[PDB]
Design a binder for this molecule. Sequence first.
Ligand code: HEM
Length: 157
Amino acid sequence: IEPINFMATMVRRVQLTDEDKSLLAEAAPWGKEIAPQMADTFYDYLGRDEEMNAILNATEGRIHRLHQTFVDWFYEMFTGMDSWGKAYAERRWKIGLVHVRIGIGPQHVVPAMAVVVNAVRQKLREANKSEALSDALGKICMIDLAFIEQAYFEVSS
Ligand code: HEM
């Protein structure tokens, strides 16, 4: 309802610390480096699902937009935009409403998010990044997923 307030509840409930935020903000340049490959993995994953591939069929110009929206969203987890504040919360809430409007649900987004976290965890291990960075990214992916699921709850109901 009030994005900034939902954000404070989500950072407390997922236990995302000042330390986590520092690890994310420090890894941001690396996040920016891997984002395009993450976008490609995600696109291919969605493409292999009959139901989710049907949903991704508005136009071809959609491919660029689907790649770019993903790259910016992914990088933003590392920077937090306004340090995981009001603008972050408003952007995450708008992301939630977009998915509810196109008729995608928990059966799509919860697994999709499991695949993102799995794919990022592979990149982290490839690059021999810290386990503390890996935990922090797990936390912020799950904040973002709560925003999407909460939007679906509020727009449904
Ligand atoms: C962790 C999961 C996901 C994330 C983080 C994500 C992220 C995004 C973002 C940032 C946007 C742009 C929203 C905007 O306009 O402001 C978006 C749009 C979209 N997403 Fe997702 N998404 C996810 C899952 C999915 C899934 C499972 C589908 C299934 C097909 C999907 C289909 C779309 C479509 C069709 C759009 C609109 C693109 C357009 O404007 O033409 N997304 N998503």
